[PDB]
Amino acid sequence: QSVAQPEDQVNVAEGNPLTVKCTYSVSGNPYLFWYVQYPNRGLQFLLKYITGDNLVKGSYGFEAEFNKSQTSFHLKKPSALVSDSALYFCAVRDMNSGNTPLVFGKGTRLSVIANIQKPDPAVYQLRDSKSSDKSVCLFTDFDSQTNVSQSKDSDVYITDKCVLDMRSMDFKSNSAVAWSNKFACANAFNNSIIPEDTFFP
Amino acid sequence: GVTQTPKFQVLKTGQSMTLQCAQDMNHEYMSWYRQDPGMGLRLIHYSVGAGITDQGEVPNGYNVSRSTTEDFPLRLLSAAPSQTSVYFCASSYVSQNNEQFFGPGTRLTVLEDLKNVFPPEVAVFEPSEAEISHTQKATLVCLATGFYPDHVELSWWVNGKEVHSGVCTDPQPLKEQPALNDSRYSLSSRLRVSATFWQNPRNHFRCQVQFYGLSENDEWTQDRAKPVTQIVSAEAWGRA
Domain ranges of chain B: 1-112, 113-238
CB contact under 8 A, B97 and A163: no
A31 contacts on B by Cβ (under 8 Å): 96-97
B128 contacts on A by Cβ (under 8 Å): 124-127, 138, 201
Give chain B as a 3 state SS string: CEEEECCEEEEECCCCEEEEEEECCCCCEEEEEEEECCCEEEEEEEEEECCEEEECCCCCCEEECCCCCCECCEEECCCCHHHCEEEEEEEECCCCCCCCEECCCEEEEEECCHHHCECCEEEEECCCHHHHHHHCEEEEEEEEEEEECCCEEEEEEECCEEECCCEEECCCCEECCCCCCCCCEEEEEEEEEEHHHHCCCCCEEEEEEEECCECCCCCCCCCCCCCECEEEEEEEECCC
Q: d(Cα B99, Cα A55) in Å, to the nearest integer?
A: 18
Q: Do B113-238 and B1-112 have the same topology in CATH? A: yes
Q: Which residues are bridge partners to B187 per DSSP? A: B144
A41 contacts on B by Cβ (under 8 Å): 104-105
Q: d(Cα B168, Cα A85) in Å, to the nearest integer?
A: 13
Whether the CB-CB separation of B192 and B227 falls below 8 Å is answered with no
Identity of residue A36: V
CA torsion angle B157 B160 B166 B167 (round to 10): 20
Residues contacting B46, CB < 8 A, separation 6+? A101, B29, B30, B31, B32, B53, B54, B56
Residue range B113-238 in CATH 3.90.1150.10:
no
Residue A49 CA: distances (Å) to CA of A18, A57, A75, A93, A102: 19, 9, 11, 11, 13
Test the B interface: residue of A32, A59, A124 with most B CBs within 10 Å: A124
Q: d(Cα B22, Cα B67) in Å, to the nearest integer?
A: 12
Selected residues 170-199 of chain A with any CB under 8 Å from a CB in chain B = 173, 175, 177, 179, 199
CB of B37 less than 8 A from some CB of A: no
For Cα atoms B198, B202, B204, give the angle at the middle one, nearest 5 degrees: 65
For Cα atoms A118, A119, A123, give the angle at the middle one, nearest 5 degrees: 145
CATH class of A115-199: mainly beta
Please tell me whether residue A79 adopts helix, strand or coil conformation: coil
Q: Do A115-199 and A1-114 have the same topology in CATH? A: yes
Q: d(Cα B106, Cα B34) in Å, to the nearest integer?
A: 9
CATH placement of domain B1-112: 2.60.40.10
CB of A87 less than 8 A from some CB of B: no
CB of B235 less than 8 A from some CB of A: yes
B234 contacts on A by Cβ (under 8 Å): 129-130
Please tell me whether residue A114 adopts helix, strand or coil conformation: coil
Residue A126 CA: distances (Å) to CA of A18, A133, B199, B206, B229: 38, 11, 15, 16, 30
Half-sphere exposure of B34 (CA within 13 A, CB side): 20
Can you say how many angstroms the Cα of residue B115 is from the centroid of all Cα atoms in its chain? Answer: 20
B38, B168, B235 ranked by CB distance to A164: nearest: B168
Residue of chain B nearest A3, judged by CA positions: B40
B29 contacts on A by Cβ (under 8 Å): 99, 101
Q: d(Cα B178, Cα A52) in Å, to the nearest integer?
A: 52
Q: Strand B137-147 to strand B185-194: parallel, antiparallel, or no bridges (unpaired)?
A: antiparallel
The CATH superfamily holding the domain A1-114 is Immunoglobulins (2.60.40.10)
For residues B131-155, one letter each, b for 16 or more C-beta atoms within 10 angstroms of the residue's C-beta and e for the rest, the string is: bbebbebbbbbbbbbebbbebbebb
Domain positions in chain A: 1-114, 115-199
A59 contacts on B by Cβ (under 8 Å): none
